[PDB]
Amino acid sequence: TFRRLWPTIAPFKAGLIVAGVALILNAASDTFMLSLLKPLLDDGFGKTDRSVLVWMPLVVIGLMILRGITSYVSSYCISWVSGKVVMTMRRRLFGHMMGMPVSFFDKQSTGTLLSRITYDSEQVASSSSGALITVVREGASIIGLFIMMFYYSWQLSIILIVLAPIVSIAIRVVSKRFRNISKNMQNTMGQVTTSAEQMLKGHKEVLIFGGQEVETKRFDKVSNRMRLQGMKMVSASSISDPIIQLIASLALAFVLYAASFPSVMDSLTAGTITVVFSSMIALMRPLKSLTNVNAQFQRGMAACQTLFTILDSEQEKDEGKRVIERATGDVEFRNVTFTYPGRDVPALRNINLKIPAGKTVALVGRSGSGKSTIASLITRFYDIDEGEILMDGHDLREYTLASLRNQVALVSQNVHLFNDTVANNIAYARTEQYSREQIEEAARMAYAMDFINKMDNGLDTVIGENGVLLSGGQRQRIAIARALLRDSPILILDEATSALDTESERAIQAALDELQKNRTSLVIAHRLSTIEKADEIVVVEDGVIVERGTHNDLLEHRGVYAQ
Amino acid sequence: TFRRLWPTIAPFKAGLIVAGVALILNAASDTFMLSLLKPLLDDGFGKTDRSVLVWMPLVVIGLMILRGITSYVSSYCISWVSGKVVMTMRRRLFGHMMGMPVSFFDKQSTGTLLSRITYDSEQVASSSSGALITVVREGASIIGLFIMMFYYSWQLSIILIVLAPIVSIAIRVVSKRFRNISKNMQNTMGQVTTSAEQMLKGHKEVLIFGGQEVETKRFDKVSNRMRLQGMKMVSASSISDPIIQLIASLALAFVLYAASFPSVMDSLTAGTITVVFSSMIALMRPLKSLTNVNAQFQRGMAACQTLFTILDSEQEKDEGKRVIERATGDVEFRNVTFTYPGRDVPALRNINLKIPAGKTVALVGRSGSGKSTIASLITRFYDIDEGEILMDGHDLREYTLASLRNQVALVSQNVHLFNDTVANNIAYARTEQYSREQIEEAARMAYAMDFINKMDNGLDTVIGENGVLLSGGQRQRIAIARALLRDSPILILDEATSALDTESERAIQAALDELQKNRTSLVIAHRLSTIEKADEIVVVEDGVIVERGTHNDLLEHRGVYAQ
Ligand SMILES: CCCCCCCCCCCCCC(=O)O[C@H](CCCCCCCCCCC)CC(=O)O[C@@H]1[C@@H](NC(=O)C[C@@H](CCCCCCCCCCC)OC(=O)CCCCCCCCCCC)[C@H](OC[C@H]2O[C@H](OP(=O)(O)O)[C@H](NC(=O)C[C@H](O)CCCCCCCCCCC)[C@@H](OC(=O)C[C@H](O)CCCCCCCCCCC)[C@@H]2O)O[C@H](CO[C@]2(C(=O)O)C[C@@H](O[C@]3(C(=O)O)C[C@@H](O)[C@@H](O)[C@@H]([C@H](O)CO)O3)[C@@H](O)[C@@H]([C@H](O)CO)O2)[C@H]1OP(=O)(O)O
């Protein structure tokens, strides 16, 4: 439980303990000020004297600068735990996310990963700090006030300490009822959310038929059902606080009825009774929070448990011990039967495809099956279920992923561009081993000149997100340069659109001639240039091996592009 | 803006005024209860022994059950306005949503309209009702407390009333600094969120390219900038309350300094000063919240202003006063040029396509140009930018939308399914005209579907977002019946997937054929069978009309395609 989050807290005890002391001093400052009451009313206004009257204002100002400076110190030095553990958990999650398989990213979890990184890791230490600020402050206030009563009037404290548990458990039971009701109606609010969003999703279809009068009549019945439970939210929550205050007020009436009604119980003067009868009311926040704390501690810890399910999810299983500077040998597939995680119909059964060195393979991309998975299986995005994949004799899994993944460079129109500059995203993890001259030849040979060659600014310009919103016509070319900065024995080409380009198609033929005159390439095809200019055209797709041949043998039998 | 919102709240004065009276009674309860101190400490434990004290705890518990009653009543009867200006706004927005065209849905907005219905309308009357739970309560507590000051000690309440504005504007300036600082870090929060979502969304091209350690090092800098910003934010938030409380403490010291002079004594006894100086503490939340009211009244009103920007927009321009019961005449397009809202390159250039009666026109969506924009033009999803659209020799605008949208019926592999019964789904907004015998006639005519027959619940079973989810090979089938419940002169037939299922493909083709015995059809289809047995065949892409011919002249002017 908390024992696994404790090591993260461990190097910040120097902040946590100081926050705890700054808050117990806050509670003591909110109790000595009440202790000032008895002299003020007893030795002052009752028994006429001015020493207490003159000394009380400066004492109050002193105690309030103590209240303020210690509250500020607690708030600052708890954010050195709630702001330096949020950072560490976010960074540990992020480091445990970039080395986890893209299979997790493959719609097993949607874009709520950003929420789990930011909002959840904020809430963990915003609610587990709210269950330490609360615990230390309020459990200091409780003990301080109970110490206050004993020295001043233990005749009322001996009644209060036995009145405590009923008022303490009443709030707990009513709060449990409130939380159970909220958990019950979670389904109702989820249902109205689904009913509201699905019409906005299917606006087209609902508009297609006669009219939306029936649709809004249907919406009325869910609006009413949400109204009737929005009523019940307040009818269940605003019954808790009045009932708690009424029980606490019965206790208040009990202690007040414990007056000098017994003539023996005449030890209380006005100052003696005012402090106790006031701490009675000061006891509302702490005894409430001491029982509402467990509703937030175990909830922040539930969020941390979700983050720990994320974190304990295994990284990519990296066990290869091989590195290759230039994959000279042939790359080929051998009876690679593969199923995506979460799919039953195999998108790729046994395939014996081979990619000879210095030659290209073009897969026609209209079918939409066995297109991206053949690309992915070379990069160890999704590991092969049953099969063998060989580069330079040896199997694919013998290499470490850090060594392998540089041996393949994917190029696509739908290409992710980094927040950094154009001189950095071109050479991500390659600023160290490649210099500005290399970036310049990469830009020159890749024909990125229409956007970035002419200016004397040269290399570094803002091009990414929150930049100039680079167009596709040069996203393709900067991806081409990203691949064409060498150390790319194998390339994967998408050509998803194959649409109007201002000689960017000529640029990618230049890329073809430049970086597979001696290197390999596996391509998915959507253009007549891909159909015509290709050493070996393989239209193997639909999870089946059907054709294999050059331009003369584009067809096994009459079919697609078999002219 | 509140002037325009108030008509919605007009018929709920009977709830709002009662809530106001309940809360002002709550404030008066919290004020008379504090006033009760002076009889207590001035005639019980103090000078006179016991005449007041007998009924004091009984009056206390009585006035606390009054407090509880007037809190619960004001919560319920303010929920009766927060759930009848939320429900009415939701029902009015939704009614002003299904009439608002698809141009709003596709590009001018996204799926956050569910949020705009739910959260952005809950937070209108969860903040404008918080600026009346707060206003009346905390402006009644202040007024009652001030009247109680004047009655009990008028010789030092004037000090309070002249001291009020300093502590009243100190809170305002401190909160202004707080809230102006608050919006400054929103940029940094957005920046780190953008970094964490874009680099995480770019798992592809951040992993294949080896940028793992460098990506983590980049993330560390933004984590540092988030931690430092959180430090600054918490410091700016927690400087506020201590210094406000210290100014309030200086006021406490001021009243105590006044309490020491010999002019205010002899009109200030132990009970009187006790109650008077307890009101000093009682007044903390009232005067603190009465200045933070405008931080929520004009914020919920701003949210309502966003809702009013949504609401005060324009419906589709339904400029038509003609009805049609059977679109017997030809549906033709002449020199139609159209641009999507938000796109400069025309997706549809000049067109002269004609859809004759009793003959089908087919298309292939490999190019993905002018395939949906022509489908979504018969339905008036996007209004004609320029040209002529002919319906029985009359222009499109002659018919009204309600009359026209019956005359078309789209058929698609992917399609929206309502969360309703099957008899309502097949006949949505048509249950009044067609009954269960006709529904089962349609099912009998829908040969391919077997899940709803011979099980005897398939007249009113559940298939939508609940019950049995419908697979893709059967959403198509039920859509066939939805279109094949007659009154469908015009057909749009999409084929998002070229794949075929046993007898499902033949079933949709048979549906097309019996919808070609009479009526017309415009078809998008990657499959070649429909064009093989099409009456008229076209390949119109790239906007400009290029083709007009039967199978003998399949693709004449297209060029290098050649069937
Ligand atoms: C013109 C210019 C003049 C200005 C100059 C002024 C000069 C003053 C100088 C400085 C003074 C110090 C002020 C201060 O600064 O000191 C306060 C505490 C004060 C302690 C300091 C002692 C000073 C002694 C001086 C001695 C010097 C020698 C700040 C703080 O220590 O904690 C503060 C909070 N907690 C309290 O316990 C004080 C709270 C109670 C504490 C009172 C102690 C005072 C005793 C002194 C008496 C001596 C005088 C002679 O009352 C108060 O305010 C105080 C009002 C006092 C009323 C008089 C009572 C005594 C009279 C009779 C006895 C003789 C306070 O929230 C309490 C509110 O709850 C009720 O309403 P609701 O619940 O909302 O409905 C009260 N309604 C009532 O009817 C109460 C009524 O009495 C009930 C009586 C019945 C119950 C008795 C039980 C019996 C027990 C037996 C069982 C064993 C309402 O009381 C009011 O105003 C109205 C007022 O009572 C009317 C009184 C009506 C009835 C009177 C009965 C007696 C009369 C009978 C006679 C016959 C009160 O406002 O708000 C801030 C902000 O906190 C959050 C935050 O954490 O940030 C807290 C959050 O509140 C909650 C929440 O609802 O969610 C609720 C909390 O319970 C808690 O759950 C926290 C939680 O921890 C998570 O947050 O959340 C929320 O407020 C939020 C902001 O709203 C927006 O964010 O801010 C906190 O600060 P922070 O935490 O430090 O930041």
Curated annotation (Swiss-Prot), chains A, B:
Record-listed E.C. numbers: 7.5.2.6
Domain of life according to the entry: Bacteria
Domain ABC transporter: 331-563
PROSITE patterns named among the record's database cross-references: ABC_TM1F, ABC_TRANSPORTER_1, ABC_TRANSPORTER_2, MSBA
Any GO molecular function: lipopolysaccharide floppase activity
Biological-process GO terms, alphabetical: lipid translocation; lipid transport; lipopolysaccharide transport; transmembrane transport
GO CC, alphabetical: ATP-binding cassette (ABC) transporter complex; membrane; MsbA transporter complex; plasma membrane
Protein name: ATP-dependent lipid A-core flippase
Taxonomic placement: Bacteria, Pseudomonadati, Pseudomonadota, Gammaproteobacteria, Enterobacterales
